[PDB]
Write a structure and sequence with these properties.
Bound molecules: FE2/S2 (inorganic) cluster, fe (ii) ion, magnesium ion
Radius of gyration of chain A: 23 Å
Distance between the termini of chain A: 15 Å
Pfam family, one (chains A, B, C): Aromatic_hydrox
Protein name (chains A, B, C): Terminal oxygenase component of carbazole
Largest interface: B-C, 32 and 37 residues
Shape of chain A: globular
Keywords (chains A, B, C): 2Fe-2S, Iron, Iron-sulfur, Metal-binding, Oxidoreductase
Number of helices of chain A: 11
Oligomer: homotrimer
GO molecular function, one term (chains A, B, C): metal ion binding
Strand content of chain A: 25-35%
Largest sheet of chain A: 7 strands, antiparallel
Organism (chains A, B, C): Janthinobacterium sp. (strain J3)
Chain lengths: ~375, ~375, ~375
Amino acid sequence: ANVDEAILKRVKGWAPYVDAKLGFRNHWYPVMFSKEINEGEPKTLKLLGENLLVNRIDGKLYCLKDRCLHRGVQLSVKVECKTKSTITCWYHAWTYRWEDGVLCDILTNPTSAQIGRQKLKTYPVQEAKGCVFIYLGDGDPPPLARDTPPNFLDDDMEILGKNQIIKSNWRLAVENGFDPSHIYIHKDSILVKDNDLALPLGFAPGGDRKQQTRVVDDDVVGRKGVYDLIGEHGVPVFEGTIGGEVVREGAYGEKIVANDISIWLPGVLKVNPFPNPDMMQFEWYVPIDENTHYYFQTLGKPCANDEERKKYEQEFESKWKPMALEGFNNDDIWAREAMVDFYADDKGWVNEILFESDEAIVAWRKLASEHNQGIQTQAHVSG
Amino acid sequence: ANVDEAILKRVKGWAPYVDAKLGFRNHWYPVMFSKEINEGEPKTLKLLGENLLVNRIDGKLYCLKDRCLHRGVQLSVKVECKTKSTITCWYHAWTYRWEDGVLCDILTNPTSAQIGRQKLKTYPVQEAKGCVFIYLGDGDPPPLARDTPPNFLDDDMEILGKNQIIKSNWRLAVENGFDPSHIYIHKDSILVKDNDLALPLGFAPGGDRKQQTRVVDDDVVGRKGVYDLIGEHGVPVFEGTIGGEVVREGAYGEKIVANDISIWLPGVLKVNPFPNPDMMQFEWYVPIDENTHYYFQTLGKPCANDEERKKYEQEFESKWKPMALEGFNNDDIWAREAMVDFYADDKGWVNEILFESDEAIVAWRKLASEHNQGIQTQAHVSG
Amino acid sequence: ANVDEAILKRVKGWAPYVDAKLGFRNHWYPVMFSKEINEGEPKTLKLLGENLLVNRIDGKLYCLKDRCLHRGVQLSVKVECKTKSTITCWYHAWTYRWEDGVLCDILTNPTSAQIGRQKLKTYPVQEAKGCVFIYLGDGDPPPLARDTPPNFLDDDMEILGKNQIIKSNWRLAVENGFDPSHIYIHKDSILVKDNDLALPLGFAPGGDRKQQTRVVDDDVVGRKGVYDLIGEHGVPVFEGTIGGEVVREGAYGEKIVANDISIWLPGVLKVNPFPNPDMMQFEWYVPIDENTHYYFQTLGKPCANDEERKKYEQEFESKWKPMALEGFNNDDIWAREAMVDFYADDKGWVNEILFESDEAIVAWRKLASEHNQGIQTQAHVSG
Ligand code: FES
Ligand code: FES
Ligand code: FES
Ligand SMILES: [Fe+2]
Ligand SMILES: [Fe+2]
Ligand SMILES: [Mg+2]
Ligand SMILES: [Mg+2]
Ligand SMILES: [Mg+2]
């Protein structure tokens, strides 16, 4: 539906992933932090290509599509919230209920036969760990835990993070994240120097294809994921050679990080431990449109009480955010960007030449192709 | 000719209107004010997608296509008017007469077989009421009166105005203007409060469908238009309600305006009286290209003589222009622009959900569809 | 392929020229000066739509395609030359030899089965007269002399120049440079006044529509060009008339220049003498992409020794560069740009109306259609 048929035909093993340029419908996605949306101060955003309005009413979050049923304007051009439970289009005053999207009045014509017979699309929203998730799908949603990685929701896990808009397709972000050889780009990171990380240049793989990863398509709550096992079973490269001469070495630090690396639908990576042996990183690459994503980064640490939490917050602002979320992951941002040209006409999916460590990426494309809950298309966007 | 055939088959009530992205060929259009073009100072503009040159020679206006027949450059890049009656292309000196577009000379080759055998396209041009109108069409033009609203050309009507370029398709602008319910957006206007206008929020429509409008396809000079009669049979709504609670109002005003409202081919709105009970407003939404229009605003006041026009003038400059043309209509500008995205891909014409006050708009779309003098296409722009 | 068949069928005699929007493959093109490319300091450029990396290694120049075989990134986003004879991709460290493009190592996986089984595209590169030429084609190159105008390579000919990126398609630049009547645009040039050039407004042909050009098919080096003879055989126009009245005069002058004017594949103009009797101008219009070219300008002067070269360089910097290359050719820059719109949708190639002096341009279009060594396409830009 999104990609030229010629191209889709020529990718067989994961064609629906190739098609999912706008992301996967019927999943939850984080879009902002809870502290970024205040009582009665609606925020606008784009997700899976659809513009959305999110408001907080009596502490609770609601989501309406930011497109009036009448002439298709964004309501957010001029927000008119005249009662606590409704929003009034600025143009001809069609008035919708935030709770169910029902067109419940029209100030310019109280007699209209439309009133009570139309419904603006709404989306479920839920807050968890200080993060706003929108279920960008139809019908009653599954629990949040299905579309989060293991441990993200643990009672004791304190989540902090950072969000920004990145100009690449979401899949280029996912694949960069889950790619075992990409760690080559991080070899000069200030995190690696200053936090004394052990970091190989990459890994020589051992065993055949199926041993490189482990698919998790079971799971209690229905999570679908892939664990990368390359560097559990492979030989780390610490001395990179060209024609037999050592030209570059890996980082010989003392802290062991990234023992477990996994990727989960709808597109969230878990790195454990990281950036320190006590923490986890959970980052989402959230489809905004064809060319754009939210890079929704979080760092988790278990905390039993409240002064732990206060200690963690101060470590986050002074150390983990600048050193790791920026100083390590910035190189990820421009690596994603650098893949844009080759994949932008959709021909990179056919012309790429993969090698052995891309086994993890192929597993991901397969898992996503068969376990996503729907392919967002242009018909979902303009409909 | 301009829109996907699948879309045209779904808007059968008014398909040629939806097709008319560039506007309607074979009508007169105002493009500037007479006083903005001085003797021997050609001006450049784009109309219906076509770049044009207008010049004032011995006080008479002339219009040539601003595209040399030879290599297709705009002559306006470097104007060379070497005699009063001619223009010489800056590139190889092909020289045209303003009066008939004939290639009368070539300075670079005075023996060319082309000389006297080629003709650059010219368009009729006429000045009335201090406005420059160009007949963007072929053959013998009609009287200007066919393509202007009633009273505009009355002998004592003094016209004053303002022109600017707005980034929406001309149809967005026409429909916004003729929309009986859009006046919602004007509820906080400075004009409404400072000139004691009795402006409702909308109208509960009364009587039957056929009574909401009155098509004029029966004017003796050949005018084609639609009167909006929603305020004749309908009830004005001055109190805005949601759930039976008053949330908004029309407030304090004694002056009745805009009881006479009509839209006329090729796309000009008449509102009478407005902005005061002794004036009327005529405004055009002139297609520049697919994405742009001139918003050619005029105010008409009947004036007996030279002194009465001077008093109209002072008052236009100090009160009516800042308060009404700018103050009141600025909201119209941002409303048009807010419909751009919905209609950009031609999908809005199928996906809109109209209500009762949009009878006026539908009547216009049918009128435009039936009585236009041709659809401008890209083949007219290029060839 | 690059152009619609409904246009190509309408330009019989020169359709391969109209199709060659990206230029002609399998020719040498100049892209920069020798001094701009130093030992061990790779430079990036785009040629025939392809991103290329050039490097200097032990004085010798090499050219690799700037696109990794793995995931299609430009290597030049972060250049990593880890040994003299190789470049290592910054992403997963696939490592290529400059000399043959072979994938000789991967730092991230020294056991990959890709090593020694993939080859990145290379192109021959050669330096002549201080200018770097890349053979943008396949297989073994021809001699450089085939794709350079007569006398550019003469032993005594000292070459100085200037290069810049211009936003027009390359063909518009070529046609402007070889166009006999375009000299009309140069009529007010300071060069013309200050160096007392004889410069007519144009030339009325001397007789038949078949003695205006001389096609050079022969030439033992294999060069393919057209000489413009109108200047030698026509009647110069020094008094331009409209309605029989003189409106403009040409520039009288002592110095006769541009006796010998020729255009050569792949798109290089030779003007002799110019801008003074003992000098020549050779300029290339080198396709970068569909909308852009390098304007690669050179002036040749025979210099017997170092004192003559030194004298020439001072005169170049103080006068010829500012007065001729900048002052005089600046009007050719905007003349090219002014043709963009008409030819942008490919319709100008059908809608243009040619006159007698365009016989030169037509002879060039047919020559180029005949003797080009292949049309560059998007598929070559990809694969
Ligand atoms: S566009 Fe929202 S009420 Fe008309
Ligand atoms: S383009 Fe106008 S005379 Fe050649
Ligand atoms: S993209 Fe160059 S090595 Fe992976
Ligand atoms: Fe990374
Ligand atoms: Fe309005
Ligand atoms: Mg709800
Ligand atoms: Mg005329
Ligand atoms: Mg002179």
